């Protein structure tokens, strides 16, 4: 496995991962995506924050993870009226526009950071349900602390799970993305199987809608035995392993899990560095730390420890002088011609990306390698 040279380097990157996340956590509890990247700074995403929170919870910083869940909960409780209004609009048969939906970017004080017409996404609400239930289970916490916020997210996802929206990468609003459906599934199954939430009025509805999501993925989201990027597509996306671990469309030992890991490795993994999708031109379509961590996590869960370690080593090799993990690296580019214009518009690649550090902590924990 690992010699004391490798173990010391991986332990130190875990410690630094914890420090980077907790140093940049907003005073109100939000995890920012990237404190220094021009286009992300000043905003929080539930997607980034939920995976970040899960790495922190595994690391054992109950206080930091708790303040994130407090922040999300309070932000969601403040949208109780908005969600109620959207649902009433549905009940009058007046399907609300993407422009009226709950936002993707949040300011640290819980306001819309962006206009959902341009970035409408439902995945982050599902990831938060997954994250908060997993945290409470891990540390024996009372979910009543966050329940009113959970109620808002559940009511919203039960109404809007089957709507087309932008993917994790803010593309293709007209499509229904299998890793978005997967994130919602993971959230709904988490709350629907949670004994502390057995008396919630939506308890049964969450498992019935999760079953609906799996029906839709079985009908339109599987080709040649593997998951696909969006319903009705043939291609894969680096996000798809999240549909196995942790969101649970299929278990790790399922043939569709195996074939999805194989298809992602073949189409998108170059030397351990995983690309988002074949057409990606963002910074030339580089190799994403969080996707190499996600594939590694899935390989560990399937009993492929070696394949998991190889992806972990690849990630650790992308750490800069200070131990910071970038969003992505250009060792292989899908569209090298596109990179300069991105560096010109937005500057050098987001570093650190807190989500890179969160995913590092999860994969290190899955391999039993966090400092003792
Ligand atoms: N696991």
From Swiss-Prot:
Active site: 167, 170, 327
GO biological process, one term: polysaccharide catabolic process
Keywords per UniProt: Carbohydrate metabolism, Cytoplasm, Glycosidase, Hydrolase, Polysaccharide degradation
Sequence positions that bind substrate: 117
Effect of residue 327 to A: Loss of glucohydrolase activity
Known outcome of mutating residue 170 to A: Loss of glucohydrolase activity
Gene Ontology MF term list: hydrolase activity, hydrolyzing O-glycosyl compounds
Name of the protein: Isomaltose glucohydrolase
């Amino acid at each position: 496995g690992l010699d004391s040279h490798e173990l010391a380097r991986l332990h130190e990157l875990a410690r630094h991962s914890h420090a980077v996340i907790t140093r940049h956590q907003d005073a109100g509890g939000a995890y920012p995506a990237a404190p220094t990247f021009s286009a992300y700074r000043g905003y929080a995403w539930l997607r980034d924050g939920s995976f970040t929170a899960e790495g922190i919870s595994r690391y054992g910083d109950v206080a930091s993870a708790g303040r994130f869940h407090d922040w999300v909960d309070g932000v969601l409780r403040r949208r109780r009226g908005q969600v109620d209004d959207l649902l009433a609009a549905v009940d009058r048969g007046e399907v609300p526009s993407n422009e009226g939906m709950l936002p993707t970017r949040f300011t640290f004080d819980g306001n819309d950071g962006s206009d959902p017409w341009w970035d409408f996404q439902t995945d982050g609400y599902g990831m938060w349900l997954w994250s908060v239930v997993t945290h409470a289970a891990r540390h024996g916490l009372d979910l009543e602390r966050w329940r009113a916020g959970i109620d808002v997210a559940v009511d919203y996802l039960l109404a809007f799970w089957d709507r087309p929206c932008y993917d994790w990468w803010e593309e293709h609003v007209e499509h229904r993305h299998v890793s978005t459906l997967g994130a919602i599934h993971g959230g709904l199954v988490a709350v629907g199987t949670c004994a502390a939430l057995r008396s919630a009025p939506w308890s049964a509805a969450t498992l019935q809608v999760a079953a609906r999501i799996r029906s839709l993925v079985s009908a339109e989201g599987v080709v040649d035995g593997h998951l696909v990027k969006w319903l009705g597509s043939s291609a894969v996306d680096g996000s798809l392993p999240a549909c196995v671990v942790p969101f649970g469309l299929v278990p790790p030992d399922d043939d569709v899990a195996a074939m999805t890991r194989a298809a992602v490795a073949k189409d998108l993994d170059v030397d351990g560095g995983v690309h988002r999708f074949a057409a990606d031109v963002y910074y030339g379509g580089g190799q994403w730390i969080l996707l190499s961590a996600l594939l590694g996590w899935n390989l560990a869960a399937a009993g492929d420890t070696a394949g998991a370690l190889r992806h972990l080593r690849w990630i650790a090799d992308q750490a800069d002088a200070d131990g910071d993990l970038p969003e992505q690296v250009p060792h292989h580019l899908l569209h090298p011609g596109s990179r300069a214009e991105w560096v010109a518009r937005w500057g050098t690649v987001a570093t650190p990306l807190l989500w890179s550090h969160g995913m590092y902590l999860i994969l290190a924990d899955e391999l039993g390698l966090l400092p003792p």
